[PDB]
Design a protein around this motif. Structure first.
Motif, PDB file in Angstrom:
ATOM      1  N   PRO A 106       0.789  -1.248   0.000  1.00 62.79           N
ATOM      2  CA  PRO A 106       0.000   0.000   0.000  1.00 62.79           C
ATOM      3  C   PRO A 106       0.813   1.285   0.000  1.00 62.79           C
ATOM      4  O   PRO A 106       0.310   2.312  -0.472  1.00 62.79           O
ATOM      5  N   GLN A 149       5.729   0.596  -2.566  1.00 66.69           N
ATOM      6  CA  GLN A 149       7.035  -0.025  -2.737  1.00 66.69           C
ATOM      7  C   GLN A 149       6.859  -1.525  -2.910  1.00 66.69           C
ATOM      8  O   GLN A 149       6.191  -2.168  -2.097  1.00 66.69           O
ATOM      9  N   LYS A 155       9.178   3.291  -6.690  1.00 68.59           N
ATOM     10  CA  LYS A 155       7.770   3.435  -6.361  1.00 68.59           C
ATOM     11  C   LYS A 155       6.906   3.255  -7.602  1.00 68.59           C
ATOM     12  O   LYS A 155       7.299   3.606  -8.719  1.00 68.59           O
ATOM     13  N   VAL A 202       3.136   4.277  -9.012  1.00 67.38           N
ATOM     14  CA  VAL A 202       1.962   5.113  -8.768  1.00 67.38           C
ATOM     15  C   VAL A 202       0.885   4.801  -9.802  1.00 67.38           C
ATOM     16  O   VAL A 202       1.194   4.643 -10.990  1.00 67.38           O
ATOM     17  N   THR A 252      -6.516  10.107   3.582  1.00 65.51           N
ATOM     18  CA  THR A 252      -6.028   9.796   4.922  1.00 65.51           C
ATOM     19  C   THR A 252      -6.316   8.347   5.302  1.00 65.51           C
ATOM     20  O   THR A 252      -6.681   8.049   6.439  1.00 65.51           O
ATOM     21  N   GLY A 253      -6.171   7.428   4.353  1.00 63.16           N
ATOM     22  CA  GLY A 253      -6.450   6.031   4.622  1.00 63.16           C
ATOM     23  C   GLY A 253      -5.257   5.111   4.479  1.00 63.16           C
ATOM     24  O   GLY A 253      -4.112   5.534   4.660  1.00 63.16           O
ATOM     25  N   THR A 254      -5.521   3.837   4.177  1.00 64.32           N
ATOM     26  CA  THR A 254      -4.441   2.878   3.963  1.00 64.32           C
ATOM     27  C   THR A 254      -3.629   3.232   2.723  1.00 64.32           C
ATOM     28  O   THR A 254      -2.392   3.186   2.744  1.00 64.32           O
ATOM     29  N   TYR A 255      -4.304   3.634   1.648  1.00 68.89           N
ATOM     30  CA  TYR A 255      -3.660   3.960   0.382  1.00 68.89           C
ATOM     31  C   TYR A 255      -3.422   5.456   0.230  1.00 68.89           C
ATOM     32  O   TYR A 255      -3.495   5.992  -0.881  1.00 68.89           O
ATOM     33  N   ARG A 256      -3.138   6.140   1.341  1.00 70.22           N
ATOM     34  CA  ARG A 256      -2.860   7.570   1.311  1.00 70.22           C
ATOM     35  C   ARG A 256      -1.524   7.892   0.659  1.00 70.22           C
ATOM     36  O   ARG A 256      -1.317   9.030   0.226  1.00 70.22           O
ATOM     37  N   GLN A 257      -0.615   6.922   0.579  1.00 74.62           N
ATOM     38  CA  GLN A 257       0.691   7.122  -0.027  1.00 74.62           C
ATOM     39  C   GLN A 257       0.778   6.574  -1.443  1.00 74.62           C
ATOM     40  O   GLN A 257       1.743   6.878  -2.151  1.00 74.62           O
ATOM     41  N   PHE A 273      -1.478   7.073  -4.046  1.00 72.20           N
ATOM     42  CA  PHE A 273      -1.956   7.995  -5.063  1.00 72.20           C
ATOM     43  C   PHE A 273      -1.195   9.312  -5.024  1.00 72.20           C
ATOM     44  O   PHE A 273      -0.769   9.780  -3.965  1.00 72.20           O
ATOM     45  N   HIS A 274      -1.024   9.900  -6.198  1.00 74.46           N
ATOM     46  CA  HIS A 274      -0.513  11.259  -6.291  1.00 74.46           C
ATOM     47  C   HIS A 274      -1.552  12.212  -5.711  1.00 74.46           C
ATOM     48  O   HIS A 274      -2.741  12.083  -6.028  1.00 74.46           O
ATOM     49  N   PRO A 275      -1.160  13.144  -4.837  1.00 73.04           N
ATOM     50  CA  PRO A 275      -2.153  14.043  -4.220  1.00 73.04           C
ATOM     51  C   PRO A 275      -2.893  14.940  -5.199  1.00 73.04           C
ATOM     52  O   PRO A 275      -3.994  15.401  -4.873  1.00 73.04           O
TER      53      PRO A 275
END
Ligand SMILES: Nc1nc2c(ncn2[C@@H]2O[C@H](COP(=O)(O)OP(=O)(O)OP(=O)(O)O)[C@@H](O)[C@H]2O)c(=O)[nH]1
Ligand SMILES: Nc1nc2c(ncn2[C@@H]2O[C@H](COP(=O)(O)OP(=O)(O)OP(=O)(O)O)[C@@H](O)[C@H]2O)c(=O)[nH]1
Ligand SMILES: Nc1nc2c(ncn2[C@@H]2O[C@H](COP(=O)(O)OP(=O)(O)O)[C@@H](O)[C@H]2O)c(=O)[nH]1
Ligand SMILES: Nc1nc2c(ncn2[C@@H]2O[C@H](COP(=O)(O)OP(=O)(O)O)[C@@H](O)[C@H]2O)c(=O)[nH]1
Ligand SMILES: [Mg+2]
Ligand SMILES: [Mg+2]
Lengths: 431, 437, 119, 431, 437
Positions: free
Chosen positions: E32, E35, E60, E62, E80-85, E87-89
């Protein structure tokens, strides 16, 4: 080292000067005796602006207190922060003046003019690089009008290049607080037109209103009323003694506000302005400061800012903040207020943000407005002057020691002339 | 040998220099006290610092900077700051009273007593040097010391140095925002007095960088320090070719001769890429094509001025970092074939490339994350016609009924030279619109 | 309008406010969903921390799932078991069949990479 | 983000809104001294929909308390949670006018309308994207039916694109409730017709029947009825404060609620209301939850739904559940009681699920039903108004205030048009 | 060398995306955080992620997804969840206010504010693209964001990209189950405005998913999590040929040419088999014929339409796992020898098959069982005419005397658009009839 000489004239002048020196000594960490009772060393880098070093650690203020009676001198000497002054600077008369412009400008006080000028020369020639003179008098009274205007004339004749600002208290719209106030107000502002460079018209009635509606203050006492004006003092003179991101001095404010030379009557303001109760319920940021900045219940002059138009507005910010927000809010207040500002002068706001906020505050703002609403005071005092001069009210006790009527004639002429340029530049079409 | 002389005039220029010398010191490994650190460069030192820092016999590095300001606040802050022992104590020139947003005070009354010492120190620095490249003059168009004193200084350097290149870094007034009120006056006056001696002047607007800090760097409270850091990164990217090596190395002597078509339009722009923050920089391909595409975007110029109503007259790219030059050629081909990016009819040749090997250096306590590639893009586009026209219109509205003129006529400049500068900017605007035919 | 009646009505209202009704809040508190950053200190400025703040910012940006052992609102339940059960050796060609590119393909993928950008 | 400002008006409004802020602050984990003390992280997700930020980690409710006599707000700012509001939002009137619509509308109330709108603008320009206004009152008396309607009219003509919901305590089928109430209710619902994008009608007698037919409440008092009102008036906007599988905000409910603009009078209701003795003999599931939703006893407006036809029903569930079961129960009730739903609107149910339950109460639900059965209430008010209006009774106060009989006659014209509209859509066929 | 950009609009888009992307990450070994960890990486290959991810940074991946919605909460949970990292913001785009189940709100107001932002992000993703085969657009006909702003996306992507294809996964309103009331209006409006723009829209009934989840999966307490998990398995079985080698590989542009007979007849029906549970999968002997007839059962069809009330125009079968084409062909022959399975007489061959070796991976915490083979039939029968005649009728009862019309006509639509949409659906229903005869 930029240098300002502080002068007080009359009862009002001495009282507001005492409150100003108390507040600035509290800011600089100087005890009433004179020893630096502070914490940081940043307040010693520019302490020479309002203080002169003595033997030991003492810092004597450069104040040239004047009166024609020793009563207010005794009061300010017995009061707190009264022994800090140099005892050779207290210049007081014996005959008596304080409500009569002739008694304060042509006789009685005319003997004391040489002594006051001697003290002014001694204090202003001890400076490395003199900038200006701050007189804290009050027009419409006596020595605050007469002695103040004569000292302004003498200093402007001697030093034609230094900047010169007065903090005169204008007559209230209601009451009178002095019967011959309409006479002395015109007789003082006539000399204030072609001699001074800045005049910050403070009003007792608007001071009452801002102490009552905004500050609550069930008892208004008296210390807070002059404390607000002293806050305006220290806010407008911040950049000369504290470092910041944008630095604007007295001459920069001079070239930023007044477009044409006889248009230099400014409306003061101070705006963290929190109440006794609603201070935890209030969040102080740049939006809230600007909301208090551009609010008619905050400009401490009698004139309503809705009438007339804004020629220009300064915004002296104190504290640690962001230039983008303090810039975009001065953009958006102009965008929101279309007809309030003048259209022939684009973007009538001069910002200046400085560090080191005042004591017990996060951020601070000092409103200075040059709106054309100030013509109402000129018009109203012209009305009373005409109303009493058509029947020669109180005139023989002016003429008793000279005072031919021509002084009144081409005092009233300029009195209505300034009304004429304010009306002409109020609503002129751009193109 | 390849050097610079950096003249920092005005409060804005001294703030730029405060960021710039921090960045230069961190690039060249100097300590803030001026000493090179012990137990490093054991092989005989390096000649990288010789562009900016002079070397004395004590092992300390003296920058080739002249800090000057008429107001004794910001220069005194530098003198008492962390970079106190780094600077030469006699280079830290400061006045006693400021011009206070007055061109007359900055150019005739107050500024004429200090331009003498500034010329003396500029000659001292130039004589204590080999092979002078040019003068990096950092100032602003806000005025006072920024306009009057910089104009007087450049006029005095014109008779002294002549053929030497004078790169200017000025902060242009924002399209909606002006702090001072006499900004039309002092911008028109400094443009009149810098149209004949300047060689290449970069305007870097303020609210443009505010929008860049809002979008790309993702900060809602950008102070002046972030703006000075971005301008420091711009000037480090443009002067990296004089200090490091790689592909085609572009010199201060001659990007001015490959950016200025006629000797009145020496007014290019600047754009850094990527200006992206750490978290958003982590989640993307930092590739040559997309960084050049971001350079050619209307929402990334350092001046708020749309590059769609004007044509790119000339453009120069600086690829700082491990950039392979085939990707550069492919990228510039893609922008040249794409529509909505227009060049003038006399422009089949319109790009000059310079690629280095050294990556950009991150400053601690900043916001930009360090990335292996960067492009500093200098466009001399003709889109600034609208900005020049609205400043002309503002000056017309001001001077139409003689507002804020009594100061200038009392202590300096006159209505006659006001009309002369008015017709000179009219000539500049008509030449600027005559180009695009 | 009668003035003293106006002011003492305001006075009665005020003394009813600043009677004993102010609490003088004894907790600074942190809301870990807003962020502000306005220092950006000067490089020359030599005149310019909280373990609880480090803890609250870590639990704010702690990738939720590791801070609770039982789930929350089911969007924080849909990905509760991201760990794939069994070791799942992906190199085993017998079980897993991923498409592996070849050096003859990667080169001309790079070749039409800039060719396709102006289709 | 989305944000709503709450606008207590009158005695009834200032009590119900005070209990409302108590309940929603206890839900979001706020103590009486305005600080967070909760144990769940999701409470500080959407504080900004009902609160504004104040310094030192403070949340101040976006609430305006309006009354035309000081005593109600003095009682509000005396007990618990009375010191959570901004003290400048308390807008008082030292006149009276407690049970006269005319004297609350075109008289000493209308001198306070400028102050209450100024507070409204201050609370509405201090947010990024304003959603709507919630305002609480009763349809009887001067300070909650004249002040309320004038305030709604002013805000509708100022900010027309925002949603507007009012929660009105409508009268009782039996008894009297402040004798000039038919007058006040008639020419208060008159202004409720054009404005007020949605209105929630709450009956006191229906509330008493809820407290004592199901909830026991051997000492039912007044705050418990206010709690019953505030539970649903907080549960309507729970999709704005907490995430869910299917969210539905005020604009969603308003769009899928009223087929025609003059049909925005609803019946609120709360599902898991049961006695303390009968709490043990209960199994909190979606079937029993919707069983107590579709329930003529738990309607807080009396106006029996089986004396008319439902136009649109809405369910807002809160907790851990299965929406196969939720949609299956709505399908089952629509399949079984098909004659009570209008057949020209297929599937006239809007259900939403937020999986954050209240304190205790493992699951809960809020019912909002727009039916044709409010025509009983409107017919009753029309009949009582005509009975007291035919023989010129209780009208000299209004006429000496300054109104005339034409406004009353057009008020009955609008009310009878409303009754005819509900009757027409009740008996209308598909084809 | 192949990929597809996924645009997920509305709440029904982003929750299906939360199911889809966890399925893709758990299938391809992506953690998630983004990596690829140890015991997942294999040497010198494994480019299966290139069709939905992009290798970035220093290891990484994306995803190529744009999550758009007009309201907060359901998207900042992803932020702000498990997959917060993962996705591109800048790919997690939200608006200020919600479309309020109003097609006018989604299409002629605040929906047409972030449309420039989402098309800019889609343009950036297609710039990062290394060969596009289409856009997978996930929505419900529903109300608001799934209709108005999705139809705006259809219009803008059709006028911008053009030749590129757009597959939609559209959640149809159920016959009996409903959760709103303006969805007969919204469905007809978005069908009229995306009929000319959509290339192939796969149709889904929630009620049919709940039926199959309660019957076969033995889930007496199902929810949107299970629904979107099963829909994610469907789309994974669509796209498995782009990621894994198989005996017959079929991509998006083959799928569209094989399915649709006419450019307006592009609304197929999907079913997946097996949906057997873990406890009941022990007693079964999952084989190609018995899952082909299981797909042809009139109880796994995922829109509540019995295929007996119509004819099969075409059929595409997608097999995953240990599947042999001999058993595929035997099952197809048996289905053709069946009599009640009626194809149209003008389409003699009616099956396009594909076989892939990779079995469908299952997510832990889900309800589906691990099976060695699966079928993903996406038939194009005429049974959808009954459903859309039913919802045309449901539109007609509400539009008989203007129910819920004042919102649309006050906020920007005219009265005639409803009549135009109704006559368009009438013409389309007659098109179904005249093709089916
Ligand atoms: N980027 C940036 N711009 C600045 C900074 N400080 C001032 N400015 C710009 O400078 C303008 C004000 O005029 P200045 O150039 O500062 O005038 P000055 O340099 O102080 O010269 P004097 O006024 O005579 O003392 C403002 O409009 C700002 O845009 C800074 O620290 N960073
Ligand atoms: N299968 C499935 N359907 C969903 C899910 N979420 C929403 N839906 C469907 O979406 C329909 C409602 O319309 P939406 O597309 O959700 O509207 P929206 O996306 O919330 O946009 P707004 O109405 O403007 O807020 C319902 O009928 C549901 O069937 C989900 O998680 N899974
Ligand atoms: N702030 C302040 N204002 C004063 C004071 N005394 C008088 N004034 C104002 O000044 C006017 C008259 O001033 P006056 O007493 O004659 O000053 P004097 O010449 O020193 O005696 C009145 O209208 C007052 O409002 C004072 O001590 N402080
Ligand atoms: N449910 C409920 N009803 C109330 C409340 N307060 C007052 N009422 C009803 O409102 C009626 C009178 O309203 P009133 O106080 O005159 O409103 P005002 O004119 O604005 O002060 C009474 O008969 C009560 O039944 C309350 O807190 N809850
Ligand atoms: Mg300066
Ligand atoms: Mg939604």
């Amino acid at each position: 080292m930029r240098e300002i000489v502080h002068m007080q004239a009359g009862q009002c002048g001495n009282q507001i000067g005492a409150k100003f020196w108390e507040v600035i000594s509290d800011e600089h960490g100087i005890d009433p005796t004179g020893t630096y009772h502070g914490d940081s060393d940043l307040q010693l880098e520019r302490i020479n602006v309002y203080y002169n070093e003595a033997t030991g650690g003492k810092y004597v203020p450069r104040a040239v207190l004047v009166d024609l009676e020793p009563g207010t001198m005794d009061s300010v000497r017995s009061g707190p922060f009264g022994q800090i002054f140099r005892p050779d600077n207290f210049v007081f008369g014996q005959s008596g003046a304080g409500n009569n412009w002739a008694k304060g400008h042509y006789t009685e006080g005319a003997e004391l003019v040489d002594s006051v000028l001697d003290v002014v020369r001694k204090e202003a020639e001890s400076c490395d690089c003199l900038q200006g003179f701050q007189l804290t008098h009050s027009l419409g009274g006596g020595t605050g009008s007469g002695m103040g205007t004569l000292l302004i004339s003498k200093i402007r004749e001697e030093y034609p290049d230094r900047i010169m600002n007065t903090f005169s208290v204008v007559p209230s719209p209601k009451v009178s607080d002095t019967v011959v106030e309409p006479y002395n107000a015109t007789l003082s502002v006539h000399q204030l037109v072609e001699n001074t460079d800045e005049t910050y018209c403070i009003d007792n009635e608007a001071l009452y209103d801002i102490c009552f509606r905004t500050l609550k203050l069930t008892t208004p006492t008296y210390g807070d009323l002059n404390h607000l004006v002293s806050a305006t003092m220290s806010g407008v003179t911040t950049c000369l003694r504290f470092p910041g991101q944008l630095n604007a001095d007295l001459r920069k404010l001079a070239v930023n506000m007044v477009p044409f030379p006889r248009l230099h009557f400014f409306m003061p303001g101070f705006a963290p302005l929190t109440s006794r109760g609603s201070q935890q319920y209030r969040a102080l940021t740049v939006p809230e400061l600007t909301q208090q900045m551009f609010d008619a219940k905050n400009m401490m002059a009698a004139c309503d800012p809705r009438h007339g138009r804004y020629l220009t507005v300064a915004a002296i910010f104190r504290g640690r903040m962001s230039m983008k927000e303090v810039d975009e809010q001065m953009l958006n207040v102009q965008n929101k207020n279309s007809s309030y500002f003048v259209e022939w002068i684009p973007n009538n706001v001069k910002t200046a943000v400085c560090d080191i906020p005042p004591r017990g505050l996060k951020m601070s703002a000092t409103f200075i407005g040059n709106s054309t609403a100030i013509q109402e005071l000129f018009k109203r005092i012209s009305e009373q002057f005409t109303a009493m001069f058509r029947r020669k009210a109180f005139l023989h006790w002016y003429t008793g020691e000279g005072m031919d009527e021509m002084e009144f004639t081409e005092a009233e002429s300029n009195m209505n002339d300034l009304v004429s340029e304010y009306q002409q530049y109020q609503d002129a079409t751009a193109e | 040998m390849r050097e610079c002389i950096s003249i920092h005039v005005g409060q804005a220029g001294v703030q730029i220099g405060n960021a710039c010398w921090e960045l230069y010191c961190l690039e060249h490994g100097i300590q803030p006290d001026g000493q090179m650190p012990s137990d490093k460069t054991i092989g005989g030192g390096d000649d990288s610092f010789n562009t900016f820092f002079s070397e004395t016999g004590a092992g300390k590095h003296v920058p080739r900077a002249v800090f000057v300001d008429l107001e004794p606040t910001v220069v005194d802050e530098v003198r008492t700051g962390t970079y106190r022992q780094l600077f030469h104590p006699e280079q830290l020139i400061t006045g006693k009273e400021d011009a206070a947003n007055n061109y007359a005070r900055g150019h005739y009354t107050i500024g004429k007593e200090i331009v003498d010492l500034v010329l003396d120190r500029i000659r001292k620095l130039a004589d204590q040097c080999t092979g002078l490249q040019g003068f990096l003059i950092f100032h602003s168009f806000g005025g006072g010391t920024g306009s009057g004193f910089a104009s007087l200084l450049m006029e005095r350097l014109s008779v002294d140095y002549g053929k030497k290149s004078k790169l200017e870094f000025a902060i242009y007034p924002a399209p909606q925002i002006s702090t001072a009120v006499v900004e039309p006056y002092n911008t028109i006056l400094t443009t009149h007095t810098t149209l004949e001696h300047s060689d290449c002047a970069f305007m870097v607007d303020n609210e443009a960088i505010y929008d860049i800090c809002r979008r790309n760097l993702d900060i809602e409270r950008p102070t002046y320090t972030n703006l000075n850091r971005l301008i420091a990164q711009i000037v480090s990217s443009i002067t990296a070719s004089l200090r490091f090596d790689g592909a085609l190395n572009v010199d201060l002597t001659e990007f001015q001769t490959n950016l200025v078509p006629y000797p009145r339009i020496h007014f290019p722009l600047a754009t850094y890429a990527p200006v992206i923050s750490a978290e958003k920089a982590y989640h993307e391909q930092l590739s040559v094509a997309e960084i050049t595409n971001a350079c050619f975007e209307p929402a990334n110029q350092m001046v708020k001025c749309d590059p769609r109503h004007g044509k790119y007259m000339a453009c120069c790219m600086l690829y700082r970092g491990d950039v392979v030059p085939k990707d550069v050629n492919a990228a510039i081909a893609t922008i040249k074939t794409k529509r909505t990016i227009q060049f003038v009819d006399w422009c089949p040749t319109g790009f000059k490339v310079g690629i280095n090997y050294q990556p950009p250096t991150v400053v601690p306590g900043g916001d930009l994350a360090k990335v292996q590639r960067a492009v500093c893009m200098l466009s001399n586009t003709t889109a600034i016609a609208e900005a020049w026209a609205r400043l002309d219109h503002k000056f017309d509205l001001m001077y139409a009924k003689r507002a804020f003129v009594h100061w200038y006529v009392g202590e300096g400049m006159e209505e006659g030279e006001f009309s002369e500068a008015r017709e000179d900017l009219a000539a500049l605007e008509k030449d600027y619109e005559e180009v695009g035919v | 309008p009668v003035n003293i009646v106006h002011q003492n009505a305001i006075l009665c209202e005020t003394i009813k406010k600043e009677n004993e009704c102010q609490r003088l809040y004894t907790n600074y508190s942190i809301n870990p969903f807003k962020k502000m950053y306005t220092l950006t200190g000067k490089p020359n400025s030599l005149h310019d921390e909280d373990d609880n703040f480090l803890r609250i910012i870590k639990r704010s940006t702690q990738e939720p799932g590791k801070k609770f052992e039982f789930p929350q609102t089911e969007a924080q339940e849909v990905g509760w078991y991201y760990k794939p059960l069994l070791p799942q050796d992906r190199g085993d060609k017998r079980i897993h069949y991923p498409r592996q590119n070849t050096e003859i393909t990667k080169y001309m993928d790079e070749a039409w990479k800039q060719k396709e950008q102006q289709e």
